Amino acid sequence: RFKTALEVKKERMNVKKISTGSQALDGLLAGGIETRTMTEFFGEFGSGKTQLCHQLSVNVQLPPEKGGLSGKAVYIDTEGTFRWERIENMAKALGLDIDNVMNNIYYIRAINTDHQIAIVDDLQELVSKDPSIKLIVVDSVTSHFRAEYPGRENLAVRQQKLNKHLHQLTRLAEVYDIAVIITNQVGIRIQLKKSRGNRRIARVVDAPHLPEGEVVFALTEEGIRDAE
């Protein structure tokens, strides 16, 4: 039939969140990763940030009753650490179908700063031609900017470009209703710190709607999960 754009906004405006696989982490996130928002995970190598980028990429495919949005993911690789083998282990843990899972994850390595900005330019067309995409992950988003504008001498210029790039990401998330996650090796900012063994701690460092505080979770062979 013939609708009004107001009906279309009401029918589509509902809060969409994507589970991390850990109930505890979800709690810290008021349910999970949210569309129309950019969420950053930052911390040291192995703190959990990239692993989360792999996990969320599969969970997004899960139906709503299982924590996903029956959507697809784009995984933009900055330092070439993306491993399908991890995606493989995770979709297996959930009993999902591997070839399909892997099939629903667009992937690309951004080789340098200009290619990284170009890719992000191109996503509108991609998410435009394919409405099933509900997740964009940009791992180590600052990597190439730090390597291309090194030192506190170039600090200001670096801040300038990055801010611009990250703005494009926000615009994308809000106009197309997509969840964007960026990670950094160091609206919502989450620090990740190594705890004992495979345990890791997550704490809200910036998020006006999220209660400040931290939680504990684990990096397991099956994926992101609650610590034993």
Author numbering: 72 to 257, 282 to 323
What wording appears in the published article?
The RecA family of DNA strand exchange proteins exists in all three kingdoms of life. These proteins play a central role in homologous recombination, an error-free DNA repair mechanism [for reviews see 1]. Members of RecA family all contain a central ATPase domain that is preceded by a short β-stranded polymerization motif (PM).
In this study, we present the crystal structure of SsoRadA 31 overwound right-handed filament at 1.93Å resolution. In contrast, chain A does not contain a visible NTD and has an average B-value of 48.2 Å2. As in other filamentous structures of archaeal and eukaryotic RecA family proteins, a conserved amino acid residue (Phe73) in the PM is responsible for the assembly of the 31 overwound right-handed SsoRadA filament. Phe73 is docked into a hydrophobic pocket (which includes Val145, Tyr177, Ile190, Asp193, Leu194, and Leu197) of the neighboring protomer. A surface charge potential analysis of the L1 motif reveals a linear basic patch on one face of the motif. This linear basic patch of SsoRadA L1 motif consists of three arginine residues (i.e., Arg217, Arg223, and Arg229), with their positively charged side chains directed upward. A closer look at this structure revealed that the linear basic patch of the L1 motif faces the arched basic patch of the (HhH)2 domains at a distance of ∼25 Å.
